[PDB]
Amino acid sequence: RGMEGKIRACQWARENQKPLLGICLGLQAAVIEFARNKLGLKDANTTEIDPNTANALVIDMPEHHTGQLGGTMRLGKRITVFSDGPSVIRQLYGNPKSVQERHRHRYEVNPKYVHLLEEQGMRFVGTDVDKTRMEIIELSGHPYFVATQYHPEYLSRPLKPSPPFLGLILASVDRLNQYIQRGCRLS
Amino acid sequence: RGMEGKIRACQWARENQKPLLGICLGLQAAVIEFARNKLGLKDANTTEIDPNTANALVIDMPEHHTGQLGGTMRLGKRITVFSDGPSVIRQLYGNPKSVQERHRHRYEVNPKYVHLLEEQGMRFVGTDVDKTRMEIIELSGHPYFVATQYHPEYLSRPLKPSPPFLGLILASVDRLNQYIQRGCRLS
């Protein structure tokens, strides 16, 4: 019920210097517009509907390790370990090293079709415990580009803001001199 | 161009316990509604248009003293001396004794037709230097009744509020705990 309109909605914002956020169910469409604009891979299309193309980057591969056996779903209590350091979704947690996050998807990225993602400005500021699944991707040169697989919106605590949507407003106007202009009128 | 509508406008507010203010050019109509409601003098009507009635209280009498001779106007640097003490238009001046006020009218009150104003609740909290002209009148029993001849609106200084309009808001809700709620927000 929609696979073409979701592609033109993200590639147009990146060309018009508009930042984006990291929302799940978007890793299948993010690799399509990146291969057609930076390079020119037209064969790479939608893989979650008709898996018949030759340049199928993200396919359907279940968990072949412990715990879940056979064709299951890629979710559960998994340990997410980052790779880099200075970024926009890591400095807000007080410089951690291993954050516990949960996912809700079933498609995984193939480690053999990521050859063209390393020779460009498409770094990986977040991997897994096996250094195979690229769950967190980031495009260099963009002023604010966030893309991952987990859902940080459900963890939006009132005492702890979310990584992506909060960093976009702070890096927009950088207005921090508002707390000193008040002074508690109802005191 | 108007003499009947101005009479029913002042007596309607006094019956509904509503306060009034002291505005000039109103002493000719204030004595008409008071003689018809408290007593029943229908002959006393408008004297500034057709002076043919028998109960003409306020007529046209110029100044017969020094300075102005003949048919002139009742105005100029005149000394106004009060008579009573506790009121609403005297306690705001720091308890004075002789305030310099100016008028702008030509009709005076007759001292021989004020016999019915002394036997009722119509005191005089302000006279002149001859104790003949009743320039300030007040109705007893009313919660806030102000009536005089001078114009306190033109003397509304930003550092000294006017007697009549300021005393009506203060005696309405008596809200004085508002300045302690702010506390200088822009500090």
Curated annotation (Swiss-Prot), chains A, B:
Signal sequence residues: none
Expression sites (tissue/organ): In ovary, expressed in oocytes, follicle cells and nurse cells. Also expressed in larval and adult testis (at protein level). In larvae, expressed in lymph gland, salivary gland, regions of the midgut, testis, optical lobe and trachea. Isoform 1 is expressed in adult testis, ovary, accessory gland and head. Isoform 2 is weakly expressed in ovary.
GO terms classed as biological process: 'de novo' CTP biosynthetic process; CTP biosynthetic process; larval lymph gland hemopoiesis; pyrimidine nucleobase biosynthetic process
Transmembrane feature ranges: none
Domain of life: Eukaryota
Residues at the catalytic site: 24 (for gatase activity), 151 (for gatase activity), 153 (for gatase activity)
Description of the deletion phenotype: Larval lethal.
Entry GO terms, CC: cytoophidium; cytoplasm; cytosol
Residue ranges constituting the Glutamine amidotransferase type-1 domain according to the UniProt record: 1-179
A GO term for molecular function: identical protein binding
Keywords: ATP-binding, Cytoplasm, Glutamine amidotransferase, Ligase, Nucleotide-binding, Phosphoprotein, Pyrimidine biosynthesis
Role summary: Catalyzes the ATP-dependent amination of UTP to CTP with either L-glutamine or ammonia as the source of nitrogen. Constitutes the rate-limiting enzyme in the synthesis of cytosine nucleotides.
Family: Belongs to the CTP synthase family.
Name the record gives this protein: CTP synthase
Gene source species: Drosophila melanogaster (Fruit fly)
